[PDB]
Every structure is written in C-alpha cells, then in structure tokens.
C-alpha cells in the first residue's frame, strides 16, 4: 500500500480508480445465423 | 460477489462505495501541557 510515506493510505482500495468502463475481447464472428433467408411461418 | 443471480460485479470493490470520511476515536484529553504559563525567554 505505498508504505513509504509516513502517512500511508488505508488499503489499496483507496489507491485505485475503480473505473466502470466495460471492455470485451474481439469476439467470435457470427456467420451463419443470418446468411439464410427466413420463412415467416404463421402456423405450426 | 453477491452472486445471487445472473451477472456479478467483479469484486467486492465493485460492490462498495469508498468513502473518504475520516474518523478519530474519543482521543485522549490533554490537560497538563496547557495549564501552565510561559516565560517568553529570548535566550538560553
């Protein structure tokens, strides 16, 4: 916790900027969900 | 944590509000140091 200071912080939690920015990885590409055309069935 | 259901924050630190209010306990009262008077010496 940066203890070389003579007046250190309580816990590391006050030494961070919890940033709520949500990032995600590149993510699989979806190819065949929609290549195909759709038959609007209206019955079973 | 609070994994109760579906979607979870990440960690406790992301389920908490980190205040910066600072508190001190009852401390101790200082009685002696100030009771007496000073002889403004200007020399050894």
Curated annotation (Swiss-Prot), chains A, B:
The gene is D20. The chain holds residues 161 to 204 of 458 of the full protein. It is found in: Virion. This is Major capsid protein. It comes from Escherichia phage T5. Interacts with the decoration protein; each hexon binds a single copy of the decoration protein. Interacts with the portal protein. Major capsid protein that self-associates to form 120 hexamers and 11 pentamers, building the T=13 icosahedral capsid which about 860 Angstroms in diameter. Responsible for its self-assembly into a procapsid. The phage does not need to encode a separate scaffolfing protein because its capsid protein contains the delta domain that carries that function. The capsid gains its final stability through the reorganization of the subunits that takes place upon expansion. DNA encapsidation through the portal triggers capsid expansion and the binding of the decoration protein to the capsid exterior.
């Amino acid at each position: 916790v940066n203890q070389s200071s003579s007046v250190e912080v309580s816990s590391e939690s006050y030494e961070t900027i919890f940033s709520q920015r949500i990032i995600r990885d590149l993510q699989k590409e979806l190819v065949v969900g929609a290549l195909f055309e759709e038959l609007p069935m209206s019955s079973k």
